[PDB]
């Protein structure tokens, strides 16, 4: 924002959700605001098949945005979230959510206000005996209503 041609940087994610956050968060790689279309092959009078008329649909949700908490530390907060949704208890699993984006300098500018978080998937990385990278506890979060802003 300081310059007259800012475009953000990949290094500014953070998020505040009512379940406890973690120190380092490597990724979050899906953020969609999809709405589909139609096809009407409307005919006038003179004979043309007409333009492909298109209309407006639901803002289809289900844009789970996979998150990657780099490192399955002793913090079992994520696996406690899913273990609730599995057994129900939707009063504490249907969590509101947010995603924060910061500038070239760390200050929020745009926030992707979610509306219903679910955490419907927890997948761990391969336990190769000899590789070098870390362990990724990838989380997939599902929505009820699409993101806002």
């Amino acid at each position: 924002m300081s310059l007259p041609k800012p475009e953000d940087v990949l290094v500014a994610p953070n998020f505040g959700i009512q379940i406890d956050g973690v120190m380092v968060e490597y990724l979050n790689s899906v953020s969609n605001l999809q709405i589909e279309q139609d096809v009407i092959r409307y005919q006038q009078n003179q004979g043309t098949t007409g333009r492909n008329n298109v209309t407006l649909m639901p803002g289809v949700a289900k844009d789970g945005s996979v998150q990657v908490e780099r490192g399955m530390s002793q913090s079992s907060v994520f696996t406690q979230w899913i273990n609730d949704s599995m057994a129900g208890r939707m009063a504490t699993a249907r969590k509101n959510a947010t995603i924060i984006v910061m500038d070239y300098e760390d200050n929020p500018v745009k926030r992707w206000n979610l509306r219903n978080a679910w955490c419907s998937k927890v997948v761990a990385g391969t336990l190769k005996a000899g590789d070098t990278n870390a362990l990724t506890e990838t989380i997939t979060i599902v929505f009820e209503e699409l993101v806002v802003e």
């Binding site: 505040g16 509101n96 947010t98 929020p108 926030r111 206000n113 509306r115």
Partner: protein
């Protein structure tokens, strides 16, 4: 449920001056008895349980068969200057929506409480109710006024003019399977139950007036519509019978003279809005004000309002005229940051 009643008065003493919870009439009997002594608490509760109702808090200040005044008998109690016993003890509950004082008016027609005490006691209820900011008061009317006495009485004798009080003019004659007799019961608890049933199904969203008073038998007077438009503008509500519909409750107007909050539907709605927000807004002693708090509060409240507008309980073609939530630097300057942040919100409600 979130509709919880609490009314106090004379009864065969159990836990004297201690708000206790009753969830079923089979539990209420197991704490005082059954209609002994002619006290009106049992009738009000039984009508409340029979006519809807989920739970209630009761304080048995009186006793089954010495003195009646503002302090003793069926009237207020400031907690013996501790404000944690009796009438003042209810301030230590914060889980009420409507409050009645039914058995107070036995004293007028049984003892020597006189009329000036009633004006003082009920006003004490209104000030207490307004102070908590979430409980509306159901006020019982004088007994056996015909058409013009109560119109003069309300507007000249004890003009209350509060935003948390509603009236119900005619009494209700209720019979008991136990005693096989019909006693003229104050018109509260019966209506207090109507509020409980109304909000649960019709939605709090609508003033619970137009409904049949289950448990009733008859009324002392049949208020014809000739004086109805003579009585509604002054704020009183009339329970009148109808040809083939039953004993229905007519009237959704409060005691306030302010035109904005004159409707009972609007005022009950905001109490539910504030109460649900209070549960929603937490981490009072969270951490630091920062910036995160301002956006977190703004998102959480709006997420709750937008869903509410989708149910139709808010007026507006699009979810913009429904509300306007602002939590920015133009609301919390650094001066108020040193103490505590603020926020603004609005809801628009209809009525007919």
């Amino acid at each position: 449920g979130t509709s919880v009643a609490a009314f106090v008065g004379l009864a065969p003493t159990g836990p004297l001056n201690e708000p206790t919870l009753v969830t079923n009439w089979t539990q209420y009997v197991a704490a005082f008895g059954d209609f002994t002594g002619g006290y009106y608490l049992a009738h009000s509760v039984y009508g409340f349980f029979n006519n809807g109702g989920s739970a209630a808090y009761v304080v048995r200040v009186g006793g089954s068969a010495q003195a009646e005044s503002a302090h003793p008998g069926p009237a207020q109690y400031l907690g013996d200057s501790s404000d944690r016993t009796g009438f003042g003890g209810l301030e230590a509950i914060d889980e009420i929506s409507m409050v009645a004082v039914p058995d107070l008016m036995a004293a007028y027609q049984r003892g020597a409480i006189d009329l000036e005490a009633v004006k003082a006691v009920q006003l004490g209820l209104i000030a207490h109710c307004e102070l908590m900011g979430d409980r509306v008061a159901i006020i019982d009317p004088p007994p056996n006024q015909n058409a013009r006495q109560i119109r003069v009485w309300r507007q000249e004798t004890a003009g209350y003019d509060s935003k948390y009080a509603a009236l119900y003019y005619p009494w209700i004659k209720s019979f008991d399977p136990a005693t096989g007799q019909s006693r003229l019961v104050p018109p509260s608890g019966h209506v207090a139950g109507i509020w409980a049933r109304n909000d649960s199904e019709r939605g709090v969203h609508k003033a619970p007036a137009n409904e049949v008073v289950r448990g009733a038998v008859d009324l002392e007077l049949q208020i014809t519509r000739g004086e109805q438009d003579l009585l509604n503008p002054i704020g009183v509500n009339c329970i009148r019978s109808f040809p083939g519909r039953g004993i229905r409750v007519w009237g959704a107007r409060t005691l306030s003279s302010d035109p904005a909050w004159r409707y009972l539907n609007i005022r009950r709605y905001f109490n539910y809005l504030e109460e649900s927000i209070l549960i929603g807004t937490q981490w009072v002693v969270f951490e630091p004000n920062d910036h995160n708090l301002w956006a977190r509060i703004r998102r959480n409240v709006s997420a709750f309002l937008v869903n509410e507008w989708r149910n139709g309980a808010l007026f507006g073609q699009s979810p913009d005229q429904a509300y306007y939530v602002k939590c920015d630097e133009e609301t919390n300057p650094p001066e108020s940051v040193d103490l505590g942040r603020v926020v603004c919100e609005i809801g628009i409600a209809p009525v007919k």
